[PDB]
Amino acid sequence: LNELQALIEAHFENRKKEEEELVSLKDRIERRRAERAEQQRIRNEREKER
C-alpha cells in the first residue's frame, strides 16, 4: 500500500508546511492591520490635539 504511505506523509507534510506558514504569514498581516488600528487611534488623537 504505497498509497497509505503517500497519504500518511502527504497529509502531514503538505498541510503542516502550508498551513503553519499561513498561520504565521497572516499573523504578520494581522499585526500590521492591528498597527493600522493603532495608527487610527493616533490619527484620532492628533486630530483632537490640533
Binding site: 497509505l4 504511505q5 500518511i8
Partner: peptide
Amino acid sequence: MDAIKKKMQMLKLDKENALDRAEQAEADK
C-alpha cells in the same frame, strides 16, 4: 488516519492468516 485504517487491515490480514493457521494447526490434531 486512513494510513492506519489501511495498516490495520494489513496487520489484520497478517494475523487473521496466522490465526487461521493457529486454529488449523490445532484443529488438524
